[PDB]
Amino acid sequence: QESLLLLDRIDSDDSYASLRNDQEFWEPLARRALEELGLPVPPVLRVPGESTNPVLVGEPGPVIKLFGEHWCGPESLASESEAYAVLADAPVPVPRLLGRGELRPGTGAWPWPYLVMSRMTGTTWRSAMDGTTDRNALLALARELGRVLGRLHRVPLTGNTVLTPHSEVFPELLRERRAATVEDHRGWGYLSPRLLDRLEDWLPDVDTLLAGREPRFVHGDLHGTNIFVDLAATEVTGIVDFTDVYAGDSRYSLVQLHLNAFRGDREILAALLDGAQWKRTEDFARELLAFTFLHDFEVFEETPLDLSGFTDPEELAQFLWGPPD
Numbered sequence: 001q002e003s004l005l006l007l008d009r010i011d012s013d014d015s016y017a018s019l020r021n022d023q024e025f026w027e028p029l030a031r032r033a034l035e036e037l038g039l040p041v042p043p044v045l046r047v048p049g050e051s052t053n054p055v056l057v058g059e060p061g062p063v064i065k066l067f068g069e070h071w072c073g074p075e076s077l078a079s080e081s082e083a084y085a086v087l088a089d090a091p092v093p094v095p096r097l098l099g100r101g102e103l104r105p106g107t108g109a110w111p112w113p114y115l116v117m118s119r120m121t122g123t124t125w126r127s128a129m130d131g132t133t134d135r136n137a138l139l140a141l142a143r144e145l146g147r148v149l150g151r152l153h154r155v156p157l158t159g160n161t162v163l164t165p166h167s168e169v170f171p172e173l174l175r176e177r178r179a180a181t182v183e184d185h186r187g188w189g190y191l192s193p194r195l196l197d198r199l200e201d202w203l204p205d206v207d208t209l210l211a212g213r214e215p216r217f218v219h220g221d222l223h224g225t226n227i228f229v230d231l232a233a234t235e236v237t238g239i240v241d242f243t244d245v246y247a248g249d250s251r252y253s254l255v256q257l258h259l260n261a262f263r264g265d266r267e268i269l270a271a272l273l274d275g276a277q278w279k280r281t282e283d284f285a286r287e288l289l290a291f292t293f294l295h296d297f298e299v300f301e302e303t304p305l306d307l308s309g310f311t312d313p314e315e316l317a318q319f320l321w322g323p324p325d
């Protein structure tokens with residue numbers, strides 16, 4: 001009975017943003033959900049941090065990921081559902097779907113559908129990197145991640161809507177971001193106004209950047225906490241969050257991986273590329289700067305590098321995506 005008022009308390013974007021990771025709010029709902037699926041209920045069940053969707057982890061138990069109506073929940077749910085269908089036998093360490101359901105019927109109100117998956121072992125990439133001064137082990141781990149990403153890119157695109165060879169979702173997103181990126185970066189204030197004034201002429205056409213490229217399985221949100229590793233064993237133990245997946249260009253994967261998980265470290269980027277035998281071209285840095293601007297997210301939000309005071313976006317491209325010094 002509590003669920004009716006509790007779920008009715010979310011009716012706007014701001015109202016959903018304030019309660020998406022409210023543990024006191026979601027804990028009883030998540031326990032009832034697990035009971036509804038016939039799954040054992042963990043004694044501890046906690047909201048592990050800032051998630052776009054409401055997420056709770058059981059201490060032994062599984063991961064519950066709920067999807068709202070506001071924060072692109074429906075689209076993200078469709079994407080992750082299709083991705084879990086496509087990843088059924090992928091040679092990549094991903095979680096297994098333990099169940100799915102809806103909290104309430106869903107005719108006049110939002111049904112609040114949810115997925116339940118297995119828990120990945122290891123530590124996040126973010127933790128492992130923030131807790132080591134052993135750069136050699138980190139680079140070896142990055143090469144292993146390069147191998148894993150090379151295999152992930154080649155998972156066959158057997159989906160129905162987003163993960164098909166002929167899907168247009170990724171180019172359409174890229175054109176939309178090509179339109180909005182310069183004003184976005186003016187509002188965000190990561191770079192100098194001169195570079196932003198040169199940007200609109202510097203950036204290429206989407207059709208030109210994507211010409212002749214083959215589609216890959218592109219995880220578009222490879223930040224530091226969607227990747228689970230065992231640093232001591234040089235093992236990638238998990239890759240999660242398929243709410244932003246595309247049949248897209250392999251280079252797009254690198255943006256969030258490098259600017260967020262790698263913190264912009266060009267040496268770690270080089271190790272990752274070495275692991276995948278991803279050969280660098282002359283325009284590689286400029287292409288990846290273009291993909292940096294065409295990304296859906298604010299990828300600079302986590303880059304511990306001051307990019308203000310930058311003219312000649314070519315220099316910015318060489319700085320962010322160039323080879324190691």
Ligand SMILES: CN[C@H]1C[C@@H](N)[C@H](O)[C@@H](O[C@@H]2O[C@H](CO)[C@H](O)[C@@H]3O[C@]4(O[C@H]23)O[C@H]([C@@H](N)CO)[C@H](O)[C@H](O)[C@H]4O)[C@@H]1O
Binds near residue numbers: 070075076079244301
């Ligand atoms: C086709 N694009 C959408 C695809 C959805 N699967 C995303 O969930 C949605 O993104 C989310 O949108 C909601 C609003 O509907 C919030 O904006 C969330 O906040 C965002 O987008 C988040 O979180 C992102 C990441 N931090 C998510 O891990 C970036 O920070 C973005 O700049 C930031 O707006 C994208 O826009």
